[PDB]
Design an enzyme around this catalytic site. Structure first.
Site, PDB file in Angstrom:
ATOM      1  N   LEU B  41       0.822  -1.197   0.000  1.00  0.00           N
ATOM      2  CA  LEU B  41       0.000   0.000   0.000  1.00  0.00           C
ATOM      3  C   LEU B  41       0.860   1.254   0.000  1.00  0.00           C
ATOM      4  CD1 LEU B  41      -2.843  -1.168   2.359  1.00  0.00           C
ATOM      5  CD2 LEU B  41      -2.904  -0.770  -0.096  1.00  0.00           C
ATOM      6  N   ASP B  42       0.289   2.317  -0.547  1.00  0.00           N
ATOM      7  CA  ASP B  42       0.958   3.599  -0.647  1.00  0.00           C
ATOM      8  C   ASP B  42       0.979   4.273   0.722  1.00  0.00           C
ATOM      9  OD1 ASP B  42       2.245   5.727  -1.754  1.00  0.00           O
ATOM     10  OD2 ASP B  42       0.616   6.333  -3.091  1.00  0.00           O
ATOM     11  N   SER B  43       1.828   5.294   0.854  1.00  0.00           N
ATOM     12  CA  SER B  43       1.811   6.104   2.068  1.00  0.00           C
ATOM     13  C   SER B  43       0.514   6.896   2.190  1.00  0.00           C
ATOM     14  CB  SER B  43       3.029   7.028   2.095  1.00  0.00           C
ATOM     15  OG  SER B  43       3.051   7.900   0.982  1.00  0.00           O
ATOM     16  N   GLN B  46      -1.825   4.539   3.660  1.00  0.00           N
ATOM     17  CA  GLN B  46      -1.622   4.407   5.100  1.00  0.00           C
ATOM     18  C   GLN B  46      -2.263   5.567   5.851  1.00  0.00           C
ATOM     19  OE1 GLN B  46       0.718   6.222   7.290  1.00  0.00           O
ATOM     20  NE2 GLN B  46       0.329   4.880   9.042  1.00  0.00           N
TER      21      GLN B  46
END
Ligand SMILES: CCCCCCCCCCCCCCCCCC(=O)OC[C@H](COP(=O)([O-])OC[C@H](O)COP(=O)([O-])OC[C@H](COC(=O)CCCCCCCCCCCCCCCCC)OC(=O)CCCCCCCCCCCCCCCCC)OC(=O)CCCCCCCCCCCCCCCCC
Ligand SMILES: CCCCCCCCCCCCCCCCCC(=O)OC[C@H](COP(=O)([O-])OCC[N+](C)(C)C)OC(=O)CCCCCCCCCCCCCCCCC
Ligand SMILES: CCCCCCCCCCCCCCCCCC(=O)OC[C@H](COP(=O)(O)OCCN)OC(=O)CCCCCCCCCCCCCCCCC
Ligand SMILES: CCCCCCCCCCCCCCCCCC(=O)OC[C@H](COP(=O)(O)OCCN)OC(=O)CCCCCCCCCCCCCCCCC
Ligand SMILES: CCCCCCCCCCCCCCCCCC(=O)OC[C@H](COP(=O)(O)OCCN)OC(=O)CCCCCCCCCCCCCCCCC
Ligand SMILES: *C(=O)CCCCCCCCCCCCC
Lengths: 177, 87, 155, 65, 128, 62, 79, 165, 459, 171, 55, 122
Positions: B41-43, B46
């Site tokens: 998952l991408d930041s 998150q």
């Protein structure tokens, strides 16, 4: 800006904090959940459009005008969680957060109302006052010369030892006393 | 009023929110499922997960604490620390 | 506490400025005293004149309600910038635009109340007519005198 | 038994709060229709406001000159 | 396009809008790491006493004692009489005294002149 | 001891306050000054028996 | 002690305005990941909430019924 | 008194239109009604003003109690942007809140009709500051606006509060 | 008055012959017996004062001051026995003897029928107060503060000596009872101008006048607790008592000599109250509040109307009780945290709830809450200064805002908010401390039931 | 009781209760319940205490000060006579104060008792109040906090000189 | 007022995003009156309470 | 409220000013106009203790209504007819006040026509 362990904010941290603040102020603007969900995907697309920018001066400039965009388009009364600062229930129960050392000031006839609790408290007190000199000599053998650079504390590097400066983190009062 | 939170209950609610998120399949997911290294998952993803945690449990996690929650077990343990569960 | 950790006179030589900055536990590059015009500050640092509400509210403060650490040099008006008092936090609308909007709204409303006082509304009626010489005795008029007759007629 | 909390769904309702809420809503509309049926002039008007132009000049005492 | 935010005294500039926040230089990292070091040393010196089981009392802060000594005792030994202090001490010191003297003297001369002419309605005034 | 609230907080204070008003307040002048009762045409005075005469007959309007 | 959470699979956004949101996001090349989280607000017992004029007219039905009953009662009672 | 009451009942009812904390909206409501009381003192109707005090007490205490029932039921949540769908989940609170809002705005022959409407019937038909009258009527419309704002964002629609009901 | 002078003198062998564990309890007991006997001064008449002898008399002005003076000695003994527990025994007896000697000077200050005996006792009150401040004060600045307290008083009062002996030569007497009947009008001249200044400036220093008040936030701060109690409760009231005795002789010149001083007080009570908004030292905050409250007594004496004298004596008795209680509360924190900084120990209602109730009641009587005699004196001075000039209500009312604002901020800073984390020696309130608070506050609230005994010679 | 001529009350005229309705008023029921449960036991306790008073009856007196020579016929700076004159004047000042208090009580009782027609029906009390306040103001106003019989005599002499000059310049 | 605010309430369900005007920010920030007066009037007092009167 | 426009936006000399009106004699246009007759005795509405605004030319209906309202306690709905009589006679008084305003309006229009006929003639 102002952080306990980090000395600054990276560009990545600034982008993520701006992204969260933009979504929160957008949810304040866009009250209904489907409508916010639509505009939140549109704003996520706007953040994803410039995600692959390897030029740091261009990226810092885009961050700057995105902050200007945010400061223009913010809600005047954004939503704040109740126990969050600025909330309606924030620091409400601080008058009920009596510190633990006041239990040392009780009369013995009201300490004898809870014999198991204070008999169980005296071993915590004994544990802390034997752990103290071990964690002091742990701090002075690990801190560099010139003092500590950051506010990060170490864990207990042995077994049986407690982490240094642990008493007021563990024995802090509850949020709902 | 105000029913108490348990680590089983907080775990079930955190994984329940993550199972309602289309970028996470529910059978690969566990409490140790790291968001960038396992789930990929991408930041930004998150940040959206931590905001879903805030909208779920009704309190704000600060960003200096939000940017370190990189698995469900750390999120459950942070909510345990800020709600003082298992008294 | 000892004398050379207390505030002293205005620093002029750079070693005195560095000793002051070491005394207030701050960098020499960030230590700026109040300018020596003789107002009684001495070597006390001119902290940047911001409120305590502006601080990071999630930081682990030594004094949480003050939002203030231990050994950090206090502002000269720290008792003034407590969160019970003056807040200098940024506002969504500009300060001058706020003052113009509030002043114009209050001035316009008072102007229009004066306008409506100059031109009042009323009903298309005559005066309210009272018997007994416009109620002479009931309004405290003395009976040893005699007023003029106030006469009302049918219509 | 008291009301058990639920998750992501509509909560448990007591019959008593439902019948009390419906009873006082019916009591409000009963009272509104009752007082509008019996008074009917606190809303629409009590006495007919006359047209002053329809008044003749002889009852107002205006000699035509 | 966008109105630039104008910071005032009672409404400062936000951190998100300040250009000097976006300095990525080496010397700003030097200053920020040195401030972090000073603040961490102060934090460590605080909580080595704060968490001490033997200590029972007040952790004396030299910053607080220093603040009160600046606010009270250091004022006169660092006073210099000059143009600005004389004009401000005579402007805010005796200016209001002159002002309220002439206002109250004018009001009481007007009142006494009305009273000794029989003009002021002092009919039911028997408490004073 | 089931209606002890109506005895200790009501009835004994009514006793005390009526004793205070009847034998220490109204024994002094102008302490309790009541507005005199509103008199209408057609009334009868209890102290005297004087009948208040009625009004004039109305110029009936409707 | 233990509280049982329901099946997560039942919160599908078909039949909800989240479906219309996903239609308008697919109309320009996007996709909404948090729809099934938002699905419980638009389904179940919270589905089909009243309008404002329906909220005002709560109890108008039984109230008007008792009104007609009382008007008939007072019209028969005077004779 | 007429000018100051009209200024207050305009300004506070105008500020009430965009607030999101429910207790702030009801506080601007009661300050608007106090401004209306100052208006009807200013038109030489003190007994109608006192009747409006005795009238306003019932439904405004009830509106605060219904809002506090909503606040306690939503775990100390006071913002109306985290409400909704409370028509059926809280039926008695919904009923009493709608009755309170209709009494506040002046639904006919509820309690707020028996003073406030008469206040308007004496505010129009008197030798009055006309700007004070027109701002009083604009405030009267604003009362209905914030009342249905409360009913809309709190009782109508779909939920916005969190998932542990 | 010799039935009060001789027991006060017999407190000296009572305190020097007691056993070492008994020298507080015996003096407290017998000083309470003297204060119980002090109510026999209330034999006051509508026409005449209670004239005991050629030397001593008491009207209804001196009588509440005498009851307050004889009541303050047991409270000073209670306040000052904790911090002098470690003291040497002979120095402890010398401390108690200084308080007894100060009371002995005060009770024949207020009852002096003749004005130079009033001056001799009025200046004899310096020496025990000076010795107490400069010997049992805590900090370094007590020597300087004793110098300021000494040399403002004497610089104001040695002209008063010459003025009183001049009245002695001109009128033949300084009997106040004779000078009630032989007073001549004091005409407009420069001779009578400096006559008026020599009669009034010593009491202007004692009140204090604004501008002359600089001795007070040192002498009331650098003193021990008994010294602060007797200074702010009695020794500021020697000035008001002396003005109310001495403005008899100063008419009609006072009717225009008062105009600057009234300004200095009417603006002064705006400034000093405002100073209490920004004080860091709690004891200094109570000191500048004392200056602010005594400015009203200066205005009420200088406008010389009956309502003003009634309000001024009510406000002096009320401020004596209130300010003494506030200093005792500040000492109750200072014995625990060992610093007078107000921002240091916060949130103390979380730890000391009954003591926070005492703080609340002292701050409500400080802000002149009705129907306390604080408000009775405040309100009557406001009535009389409204009759003096209808504009002064502004300077009154703005003061009555700021008087609220520092009274609650002091309550909010000390008692409310989150408590200070590093302070952990906050003991529970001793029975002595709450006893001292109740012996301050319960007379102050009981006097609201019968205020006519503290309303002075022209009730 | 008190003296009904110094605190005068007009005759109470209450109407006979002429009920037109058929519903009973609760006030008569509560009046009978107050007569039984409250008025009779309070009456019995007061009669008990009054019998205990009558078992030992003793008397107190109104103190009578005979008039001494006033300040006019006292020599200048003669303290033994002007002291007595001053005590006489101070007692007269306190008594005149209470006379003003009596007339204020009359005016306030008249205003409440007459209720709505108080402006017409209390003209005599208003007139007596205006006369006694004019007398008190001519006699004692503006003397000061250090008032004396000499101050009041000087004020009276200044007022009499003003009246004499106004009379003489009008003739 | 009810009908106009029904229009206001139904325009909130629309899928449009609007920027806040100056009427909206004037009403939402309490007529700007607690923002200005609770920053300005303490300031000119408390500086004057310290710099002028105290210091 | 069109008369507000006729006095403010129009011409004001032809609209009667409500502070000082009638400006014309009460017989100007009236051969033997009769007076308004007071029914309630001044002593009767003195003993009824009426408010000094309520002692107008129709206070006798209010005296009968208050006597009804006292004599029918606790039945507070049993005097609707006396209240309607008092409200109708207050309505008649308000109609008479409207008639006075209309008489003054038509007389100021008459004075306008009189001065215009004069200025056209001479
Ligand atoms: C001649 C005989 C007279 C007999 C009658 C007595 C007359 C009055 C005397 C004094 C009465 C108050 C004394 C108690 C207060 C101090 C101690 C305290 O706080 O205790 C709390 C404690 C209960 O609390 P807790 O839970 O145990 O612990 C405290 C908490 O930790 C924390 O506490 P908290 O914060 O939760 O609670 C504090 C609370 C906090 O509340 C407030 O601060 C609000 C108060 C202000 C607003 C409301 C009042 C406004 C004024 C109206 C009332 C007066 C006039 C009324 C008449 C009609 C209008 C004219 O205050 C109260 O509850 C006290 C209520 C009464 C307050 C009086 C006004 C004080 C305000 C400042 C001065 C204003 C003018 C005063 C005029 C006095 C006239 C007599 O009370 C006691 O234990 C009581 C002890 C015994 C008291 C004896 C009192 C008499 C002593 C005299 C002895 C010699 C004469 C013989 C008579 C003996 C009679 C028994
Ligand atoms: C707090 C500090 C300041 C204190 C200020 C005290 C008051 C200020 C003025 C004091 C003047 C001196 C005392 C006056 C006594 C008057 C008695 C009298 O008989 O007066 C009438 C007499 C008149 O003389 P006579 O009465 O003998 O004459 C007969 C009468 N005629 C006039 C008709 C002929 O006045 C004087 O003789 C002189 C009065 C003025 C004296 C000036 C010298 C002193 C200078 C100022 C000193 C100020 C304080 C010093 C300390 C400052 C701080 C260190
Ligand atoms: C019919 C006529 C009608 C006339 C109407 C208008 C008359 C008054 C004119 C305006 C004066 C009053 C308003 C200005 C002062 C307001 C002060 C205040 O309330 O400050 C509040 C402020 C905190 O407020 P806030 O930031 O909202 O708090 C929430 C988050 N912290 O709190 C603080 O900052 C703490 C401040 C403590 C110190 C106060 C300093 C200022 C004192 C001002 C005194 C004013 C005296 C006025 C006298 C008038 C006489 C006629
Ligand atoms: C006038 C003037 O310029 O005074 C300045 C002078 C010092 O001169 P400087 O400016 O340093 O060169 O400073 C001086 O001469 C000393 C001060 C002059 C007198 C000031 C009088 C008023 C002071 C406040 C009184 C408050 C009461
Ligand atoms: C500083 C700290 C804070 C303050 C503490 C107190 C200090 C001051 C105490 C004394 C105050 C000043 C003296 C009292 C003022 C009385 C009124 C007055 O003098 O008015 C000014 C005067 C007006 O003239 P007039 O009063 O008629 O003089 C003729 C007298 N037969 O004008 C004149 O006659 C012209 C000027 C003459 C010079 C007077 C000098 C002596 C007085 C000041 C010392
Ligand atoms: C002329 O119009 C006389 C009436 C009083 C002045 C005008 C009042 C206008 C506002 C009230 C009516 C509003 C109808 C929607």
């Amino acid at each position: 800006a102002f952080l306990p362990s980090a000395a600054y904010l990276t560009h990545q941290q600034k982008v993520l904090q701006l992204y969260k603040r933009a979504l929160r102020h957008l949810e304040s603007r866009c009250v209904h959940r489907d409508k916010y969900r639509y505009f939140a995907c549109l704003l996520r697309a706007r953040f994803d459009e410039h995600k692959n920018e390897k030029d740091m001066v261009k990226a810092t400039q885009l961050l700057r005008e995105a902050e200007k965009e945010f400061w223009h388009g913010q809600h005047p009364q954004p939503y704040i969680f109740p126990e969050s600062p600025g909330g309606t229930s924030y620091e409400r129960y601080e008058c009920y957060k009596v510190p633990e050392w006041c239990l040392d000031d009780w009369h013995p006839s009201e300490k004898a109302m809870y014999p198991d609790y204070f008999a169980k408290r005296e071993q915590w007190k004994k544990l802390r006052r034997e752990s103290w000199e071990r964690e002091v000599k742990q701090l002075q053998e690990e801190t560099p010369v010139g003092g500590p650079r950051t506010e990060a504390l170490p864990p207990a590097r042995k077994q049986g030892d407690l982490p240094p400066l642990w008493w007021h983190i563990v024995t802090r009062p509850r949020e709902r006393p | 009023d105000a029913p108490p939170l348990t680590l089983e209950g907080i775990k079930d609610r955190v994984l329940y929110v993550l199972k309602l998120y289309d970028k996470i399949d529910p059978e690969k997911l566990s409490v140790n499922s790291h968001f960038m290294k396992d789930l990929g998952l991408d930041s930004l993803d998150q940040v959206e997960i931590i905001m879903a945690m805030e909208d779920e449990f009704g309190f704000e996690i600060p960003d200096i604490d939000a940017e370190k929650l990189m698995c469900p077990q750390e999120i459950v343990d942070y909510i345990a620390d800020k709600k003082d569960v298992y008294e | 506490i000892t004398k050379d950790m207390l505030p002293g006179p205005y620093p002029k030589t750079p070693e005195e400025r560095a000793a002051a900055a070491k005394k207030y536990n701050m960098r020499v590059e960030d230590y700026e005293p109040y300018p020596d015009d003789g107002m009684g500050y001495g070597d006390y640092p001119k902290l940047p004149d911001r409120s305590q509400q502006e601080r990071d509210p999630w930081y682990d403060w030594d004094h949480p309600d003050l939002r203030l650490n231990w050994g950090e040099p206090m502002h000269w008006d720290l008792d003034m910038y407590i969160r019970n008092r003056v807040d200098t936090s940024p506002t969504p609308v500009n300060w001058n635009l706020m003052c113009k909007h509030l002043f114009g709204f209050v001035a316009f409303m008072l102007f229009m109340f004066w306008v409506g006082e100059t031109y009042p509304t009323y009903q298309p009626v005559g005066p309210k007519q009272y018997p007994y010489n416009n109620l002479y005795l009931e309004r405290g008029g003395d009976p040893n005198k005699e007023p003029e007759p106030v006469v009302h007629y049918e219509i | 038994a008291h009301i058990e909390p639920r998750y992501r769904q509509f909560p448990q309702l007591t019959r008593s709060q439902v019948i009390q809420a419906e009873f006082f809503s019916a009591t409000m509309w009963f009272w509104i229709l009752w007082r509008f049926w019996h008074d009917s002039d606190a809303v629409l008007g009590h006495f007919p406001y006359p047209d002053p132009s329809q008044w003749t000049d002889e009852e107002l005492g205006i000699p035509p000159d | 396009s966008f109105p630039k935010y104008e910071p005032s005294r009672l409404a400062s500039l936000p951190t998100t809008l300040d250009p000097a926040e976006y300095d990525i230089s080496s010397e700003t990292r030097k200053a920020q790491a040195e401030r972090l070091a000073i603040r961490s040393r102060l934090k460590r010196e605080y909580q080595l006493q704060y968490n001490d089981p033997s200590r029972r009392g007040v952790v004396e802060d030299p910053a607080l004692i220093r603040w009160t000594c600046a606010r009270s005792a250091n004022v006169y030994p660092n006073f210099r009489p000059n143009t600005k202090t004389s004009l401000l001490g005579a402007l805010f010191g005796i200016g209001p005294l002159i002002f309220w003297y002439y206002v109250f003297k004018t009001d009481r001369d007007r009142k006494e002149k009305l009273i000794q002419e029989g003009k002021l309605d002092r009919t039911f005034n028997i408490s004073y | 001891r089931h209606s002890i609230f109506a005895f200790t907080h009501v009835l004994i204070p009514v006793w005390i306050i009526h004793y205070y008003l009847k034998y220490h307040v109204t024994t002094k002048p102008y302490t309790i000054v009541e507005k005199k009762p509103r008199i209408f045409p057609g009334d009868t005075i209890l102290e005297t028996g004087e009948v208040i005469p009625p009004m004039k007959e109305f110029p009936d309007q409707h | 002690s233990k509280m049982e959470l329901p099946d997560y699979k039942q919160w599908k956004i078909e039949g909800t305005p989240l479906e219309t949101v996903q239609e308008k996001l697919a109309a320009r090349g996007l996709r909404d990941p948090w729809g099934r989280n938002e699905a419980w607000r638009y389904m179940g017992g919270f589905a089909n909430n009243v309008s404002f004029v329906g909220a005002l007219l709560k109890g108008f039905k039984w109230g008007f019924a008792a009104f007609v009953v009382a008007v008939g009662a007072e019209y028969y009672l005077e004779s | 008194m007429l000018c100051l009451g009209a200024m207050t009942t305009l300004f506070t009812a105008m500020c009430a239109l965009t607030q999101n904390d429910i207790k702030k909206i009801i506080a601007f409501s009661t300050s608007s009604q106090l401004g209306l009381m100052m208006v009807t003192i200013g038109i030489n109707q003190p007994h109608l003003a006192f009747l409006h005090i005795c009238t306003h007490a019932f439904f405004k205490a009830m509106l605060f109690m219904c809002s506090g029932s909503i606040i306690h039921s939503l775990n100390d949540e006071q913002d109306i942007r985290k409400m909704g769908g409370l028509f059926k989940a809280m039926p008695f609170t919904t009923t009493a809140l709608i009755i309170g809002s209709l009494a506040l705005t002046g639904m006919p022959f509820l309690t707020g009709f028996y003073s406030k409407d008469l206040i308007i019937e004496s505010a129009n038909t008197s030798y009055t500051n006309a700007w004070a009258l027109l701002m009083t009527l604009v405030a009267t419309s604003f009362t209905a606006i914030y009342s249905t704002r409360i009913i809309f964002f709190a009782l109508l629609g779909q939920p916005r509060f969190p998932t542990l009901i | 008055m010799l039935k009060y002078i001789i027991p006060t003198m017999m407190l000296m062998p009572l305190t020097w012959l007691s056993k070492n564990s008994m020298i507080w309890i015996n003096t407290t007991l017998h000083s309470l017996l003297i204060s119980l006997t002090s109510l026999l001064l209330l034999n006051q008449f509508g026409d005449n004062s209670l004239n005991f002898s050629l030397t001593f008399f008491s009207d209804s002005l001196s009588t509440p001051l005498l009851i307050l003076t004889m009541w303050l000695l047991p409270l000073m003994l209670m306040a000052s026995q904790h911090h002098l527990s470690k003291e040497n025994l002979a120095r402890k007896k010398l401390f108690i003897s200084m308080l007894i000697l100060l009371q002995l000077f005060l009770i024949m200050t207020f009852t002096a029928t003749e004005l130079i005996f009033f001056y001799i006792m009025f200046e004899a009150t310096l020496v025990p107060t000076l010795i107490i401040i400069t010997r049992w004060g805590n900090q370094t600045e007590r020597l300087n503060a004793g110098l300021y307290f000494l040399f403002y008083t004497l610089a104001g009062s040695l002209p008063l000596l010459v003025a009183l002996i001049y009245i002695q030569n001109t009128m033949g007497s300084l009997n106040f009872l004779i000078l009630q009947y032989w007073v001549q009008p004091m005409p407009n001249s420069w001779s009578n101008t400096f006559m008026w200044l020599a009669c009034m400036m010593a009491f202007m220093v004692k009140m204090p006048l604004y501008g002359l008040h600089l001795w007070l936030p040192k002498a009331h701060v650098e003193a021990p607790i008994a010294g602060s109690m007797v200074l702010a409760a009695i020794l500021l009231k020697l000035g008001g008592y002396g003005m109310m005795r001495i403005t008899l002789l100063l008419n009609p010149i006072t009717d225009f000599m008062a105009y600057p001083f009234i300004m200095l007080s009417l603006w002064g009570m705006i400034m000093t109250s405002s100073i209490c908004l920004r004080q860091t030292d709690l004891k200094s905050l109570i000191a500048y509040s004392s200056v602010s409250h005594m400015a009203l007594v200066i205005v009420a004496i200088l406008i010389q109307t009956p309502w003003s004298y009634m309000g001024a004596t009510a406000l002096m008795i009320a401020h004596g009780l209130t300010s003494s209680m506030l200093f005792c509360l500040a000492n109750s924190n200072y014995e625990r945290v060992h610093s007078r900084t107000m921002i240091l120990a916060r949130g103390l209602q979380t730890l000391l709830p009954l003591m926070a109730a005492w703080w609340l009641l002292a701050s409500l009587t400080n802000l002149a809450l009705p129907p306390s005699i604080n408000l009775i004196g405040e309100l009557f001075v406001v009535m009389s200064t409204f009759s003096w000039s209808n504009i002064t209500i502004i300077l009154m009312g703005l003061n009555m805002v700021i008087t609220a604002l520092y009274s609650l901020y002091m309550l909010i800073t000390t008692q409310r908010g989150k408590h200070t984390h590093h302070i952990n020696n906050i003991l529970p309130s001793f029975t002595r401390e709450n006893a001292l608070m109740s012996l301050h506050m319960l007379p102050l609230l009981l006097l609201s039931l019968n205020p006519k005994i503290i309303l002075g010679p022209l009730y | 009781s008190w003296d009904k001529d110094v605190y005068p009350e007009p005759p109470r005229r209450t109407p006979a209760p002429s009920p037109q309705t058929s519903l009973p008023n609760p006030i008569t029921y509560l009046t009978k319940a107050f007569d039984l449960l409250v008025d009779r036991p309070v009456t019995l306790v007061r009669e008990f205490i009054e019998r205990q008073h009558a078992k030992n009856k003793y008397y107190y007196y109104h103190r009578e000060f005979r008039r001494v020579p006033d300040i006019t016929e006292c020599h200048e700076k003669d303290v033994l006579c002007m002291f007595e004159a001053e005590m006489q004047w101070k007692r007269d000042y306190k008594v005149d104060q209470e006379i003003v208090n009596i007339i204020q009580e009359r005016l306030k009782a008249c205003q409440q008792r007459e209720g709505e027609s108080h402006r017409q029906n209390c003209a005599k009390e208003l007139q007596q109040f205006t006369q006694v306040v004019k007398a008190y103001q001519d006699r004692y106003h503006d003397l000061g906090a250090h008032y004396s019989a000499r101050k009041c005599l000087a004020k009276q002499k200044q007022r009499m000189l003003a009246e004499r000059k106004a009379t003489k310049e009008a003739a | 007022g009810f009908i106009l605010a029904l229009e206001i309430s139904n325009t909130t369900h629309y899928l449009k995003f609007n920027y806040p005007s100056n009427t909206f920010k004037f009403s939402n920030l309490l007529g700007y009156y607690p923002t200005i007066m609770h920053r300005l009037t303490p300031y000119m007092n408390l500086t004057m309470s310290q710099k002028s009167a105290s210091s | 409220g069109a008369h507000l426009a006729r006095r403010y936006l129009g011409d004001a000399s032809v609209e009667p000013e409500p502070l000082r009106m009638p400006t014309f004699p009460p017989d100007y246009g009236f051969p033997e106009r009769k007076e308004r007759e007071m029914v309630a005795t001044q002593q009767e509405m003195n003993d009824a203790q009426l408010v000094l605004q309520q002692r107008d030319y129709c206070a006798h209906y209010l005296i009968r209504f208050l006597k009804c309202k006292r004599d029918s306690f606790p039945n507070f709905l049993a005097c609707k007819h006396e209240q309607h009589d008092w409200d109708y006679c207050e309505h008649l008084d308000y109609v008479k006040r409207m008639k006075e305003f209309e008489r003054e309006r038509r007389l100021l229009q008459r004075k306008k026509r009189r001065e215009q006929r004069e200025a056209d003639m001479a």
